[PDB]
Chains A and B, each alone.
Chain A
Amino acid sequence: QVQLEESGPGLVRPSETLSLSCTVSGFPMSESYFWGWIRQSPGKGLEWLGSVIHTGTTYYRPSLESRLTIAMDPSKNQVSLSLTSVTVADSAMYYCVRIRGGSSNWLDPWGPGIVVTASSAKTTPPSVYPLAPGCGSSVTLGCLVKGYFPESVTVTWNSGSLSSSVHTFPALLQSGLYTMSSSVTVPSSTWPSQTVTCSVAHPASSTTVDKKIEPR
């Protein structure tokens, strides 16, 4: 029963080479299928990179062909990807795939995917900035959690005896550093009399920041 699994480093430094492996189980690599690689950037679409078959024939995305090497070793049930001269634009989920040869060109199955992050960053705690209204029945405050590395952070809120609704937004990778935000909504006319604080924990830097949201 055919299964694919990608492995390799999740972090790659710009200018260096990205090297990934894919292990095939339950199916012979000596059959008439290609084995290849697809990638997908967060919130974007799917991009075919290339493929290889046991005879040695390879196909590459022409725009990446000079940087891409895809190979296979059936003695290790392996397909490999090597992408040289990595940039920040190469951050993506990378998928290995079995591809039917010939005019069919269909992709099945796909591996679960491996997250590749291209960044030169050191371990960096977040800078946490308060989000207070500019000068209805509720008010919304927040915390901007900027310029941290690596993932992840956790944001918790303390709004005392106020009923609250928390929205914690996913992170964006911008120039090798993450930014996220979190908001808390409390009843209008409660805050600022009643205190509201975000606690942002970044275990990688052993740092937690407790930011009280002050009125402007």
Chain B
Amino acid sequence: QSVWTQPPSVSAAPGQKVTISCSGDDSILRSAFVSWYQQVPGSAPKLVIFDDRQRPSGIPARFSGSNSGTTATLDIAGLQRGDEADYYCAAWNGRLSAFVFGSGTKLTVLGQPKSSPSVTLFPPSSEELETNKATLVCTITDFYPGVVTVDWKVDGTPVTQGMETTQPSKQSNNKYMASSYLTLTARAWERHSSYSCQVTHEGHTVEKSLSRAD
């Protein structure tokens, strides 16, 4: 594949460990050296493992790599706050003739209790509707860890088009916030009845809905 499969996120408390997998088709990773990169979303990635299991200068033995031939794994033991980052694997894919990255895994080093998202759903304003457009806004705040998935429904049916969600950003209290937008024409707004924003966080959903006729 042109992207290696990684879990979207992992978390653990300081002092604990995590394992991050990176997989390709069949045993394609036996044929290539896998490298791992650490990125704080505000900055460039940094090399932490090369040649499956070697560490560059300055990287502690807390970081280790393995490669099963099918799946490569990054192990991060003795977790510290500064380890918090997105992690990517990478390797040459000879079947595609390209250097391929994994899809990335967000690591949270748990510094406060879980906090479920506070969701608010807004209808389009009459002012926007005068321009022949309608945007619903679903604000999402005070969640920790900073990972959510957002699903929209219109008339009880999943929306597949016209949705976009921001990447979570940190609040002053180190919880996270994000916003999701459903963009429709004014006519489509007028021709549907119920609208729902569903936020999944740590395996549980928080949903807000409205009816246009209110």
Binding site for B on A (CB under 8 A): 42-43, 45-48, 59, 61-62, 95, 100, 103-113, 127, 129-135, 140, 142, 144, 146, 167, 169-170, 172, 174, 179-181, 183, 216
Contacts and interface: CB of A to CB of B under 8 A. Distances in A.
Contact of A134 (B88, B103, B104, B121): B121
A152 to B, nearest CB: 14
Contacts, number: 131
Contact of A179 (B120, B169, B181): B181
B195 to A, nearest CB: 9
Interface in B68-121: 88, 90-92, 96-104, 120-121
A105 B99 contact: yes
Interface of B is mostly: strand
B125 interface: yes
Interface of B: 3, 32-33, 35, 37, 43-47, 50-51, 56, 88, 90-92, 96-104, 120-125, 127-128, 131, 135, 137, 139, 141, 164, 166-167, 169, 171, 177-179, 181, 183, 210-211, 214
Which 8 residue pairs spanning A and B have beta carbons closest together?
Answer: A43-B167, A108-B47, A169-B179, A106-B50, A110-B44, A48-B99, A135-B214, A129-B125
Contacts of A180: 179
B189 to A, nearest CB: 13
Nearest to B129: A129
Contacts of B44: 95, 109-113
Contacts of A167: 139, 141, 171, 177
Given A135-B214, A142-B120, A181-B139, 15 more contacts: A46-B88, A59-B99, A105-B99, A108-B50, A109-B47, A110-B46, A113-B43, A130-B127, A134-B210, A140-B120, A169-B177, A170-B166, A170-B167, A172-B181, A181-B137
